[PDB]
């Protein structure tokens, strides 16, 4: 197990494709090393900024972690796309899926007010994203009001 | 009595005790403090290399 771990650490340090990172996560999951999976994801989002990587991390924390971590990883995702918006790394569809996922997760946790604040502040930050407005429409049609 | 206890505590604080005062926990304490970004939360590249590359400008050349 320790040799396999050192092998994955070297491989990932050489900046390989997403397949190697996914395999390393699967390895630590086999080891039930949840802190190792957090550390790998902490590196993986830097090596592969695509929004599916962040959503893989939040998907992990939902099944193998506490809600404090899940909120903190979503907050890292938004703070990251907000600070790095000037690079245009993510497409609008990616940021939209991140915000919608975060809003629906806060809606599941019965904190509809914090999802509403999330949608308002995110729309204020990125007014050019139509997909984000449509996501607010989808949310408001089932959790909002008629007016 | 409680106001007196608070007074005694504040005195002991002033006269002695005052002289002695993972990614997600770091992120939470950074969030508390907030009441480039990557280099403060992450601790070593890709995003740094890309932003550093985008900041510069290639020299202009006339078309052939």
């Amino acid at each position: 197990v320790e040799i396999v771990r050192s092998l994955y650490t070297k491989w990932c340090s050489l900046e390989p494709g997403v397949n190697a990172w996914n395999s390393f996560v699967d390895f630590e999951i086999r080891q039930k090393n949840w802190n190792g999976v957090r550390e790998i994801y902490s590196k993986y989002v830097m090596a592969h900024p695509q929004m599916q990587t962040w959503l893989k991390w939040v998907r992990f924390e939902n099944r193998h972690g506490n809600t404090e971590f899940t909120r903190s990883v979503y907050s890292l995702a938004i703070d990251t796309v907000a600070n790095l918006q000037n690079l245009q790394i993510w497409s609008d569809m990616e940021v939209a899926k991140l915000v919608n996922s975060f809003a629906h997760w806060e809606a599941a946790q019965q904190e509809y007010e914090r999802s509403s604040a999330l949608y308002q502040i995110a729309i204020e930050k990125w007014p050019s994203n139509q997909l984000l407005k449509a996501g607010l429409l989808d949310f408001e049609k089932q959790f909002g009001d008629i007016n | 009595l409680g106001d007196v206890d608070k007074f005694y505590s504040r005195i002991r604080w002033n006269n002695q005790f005052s002289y002695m005062a993972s990614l997600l926990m770091r992120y939470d304490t950074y969030r508390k403090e907030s009441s480039a970004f990557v280099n403060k939360i992450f601790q070593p590249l890709i995003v740094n290399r890309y932003e550093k590359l985008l900041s510069q400008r290639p020299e202009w050349h006339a078309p052939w």
């Binding site: 050192s6 070297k10 340090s13 050489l14 900046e15 | 290399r49 550093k52 510069q56 290639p58 020299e59």
Partner: peptide, 25 residues
């Protein structure tokens, strides 16, 4: 340990001039 693929280093793949175009050669 650092015995695995000792000769392979990330810095060998990174172009040195991307961080500073005006680097002197």
């Amino acid at each position: 340990t650092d015995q695995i693929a000792k000769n392979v280093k990330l810095d060998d793949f990174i172009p040195k001039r991307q961080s500073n175009f005006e680097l002197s050669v």
